[PDB]
Amino acid sequence: AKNKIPNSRLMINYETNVDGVLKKKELPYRVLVVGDLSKGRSVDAKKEFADREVRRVNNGV
Amino acid sequence: QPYNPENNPVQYKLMEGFNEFVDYDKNESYLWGPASIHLVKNMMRSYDKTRWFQYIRGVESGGYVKNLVACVYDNKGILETKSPLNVLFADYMELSLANIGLIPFVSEKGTSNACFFSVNSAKKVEEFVDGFDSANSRLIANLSYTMCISRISHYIKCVIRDKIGSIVDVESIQKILSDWISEFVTTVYQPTPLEMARYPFRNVSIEVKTIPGKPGWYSCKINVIPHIQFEGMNTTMTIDTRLEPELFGTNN
């Protein structure tokens, strides 16, 4: 409440606020490969080059 | 306490059966008395024991007022006690009254007791920018000091009357008046409150000086700083984890 509690004679509060600059997780060294894989036969290959979402191979080939 | 047979029985006579005698009350209307009594009845106490009026505030120090006339009654339950005080002031009430210039007679719930936390006059407290000025008004509003400073007036216009005709000087009146009050000024603190409340004041100046024209007349000007009482405090707790870097520091 912004109205704030009425102050007593012995108001103890306990500060729990902490400032600081957040961390940054490392960057995985990405490796792009470009070659004719589908020969023009894939969902992302049949689409225009202006919109081809790059894959990731999170799982495996 | 109103009159019941099982509670506060009327002390009958040695044959006239009277102890079986009730009264008629319920909510809140059976005789009251102003807190001012116990307030003054503590100033008296704070005089026979100590000598000045520091001993009229707080629990450990002055106003405690032990053993009050509570009340109990059996409506349907089992003797539900009734707090001795008119009103059960909370904590911030004790303070939020002191600023209005009032003296709250706060009670300890169930304990059947009380205590005067604040003893302020009706004088405005002001605020001011300059710190000194702000502190002045805080001590002047405080009744307990004006009780003490008053006791110096009862010394001057009372005792110095004896040497009204004696030949005295600027340096002699500063002696008689100071040599007295000197036994009541200290800086060191004594164990326990009572053993220290013997000393109300902290330090005093007494600069008297003769005036032109009137040869046998003078004009004093004292100034007393009383031992400032506790009044409250804020507190911020926190887990620093920077105090002992030997446990959280990089180097390990």
State the structure-solving technique.
cryo-EM
Residues from chain B contacting residue A15 (CB–CB below 8 Å): 236-238
Nearest CA-CA distance, residue B95 and chain A, Å: 7
Instruction: Give the alpha-carbon dihedral of B66, B69, B74, B75, to 10 degrees.
Output: -110
- Cβ within 8 Å, pair A6-B234: no
Using CB atoms, pick whichever of B92, B236, B238 lies closest to residue A8.
B92
Q: Are B199 and B53 within 8 A, CB to CB?
A: no
Nearest CA-CA distance, residue B76 and chain A, Å: 37
Resolution (Å units): 3.7
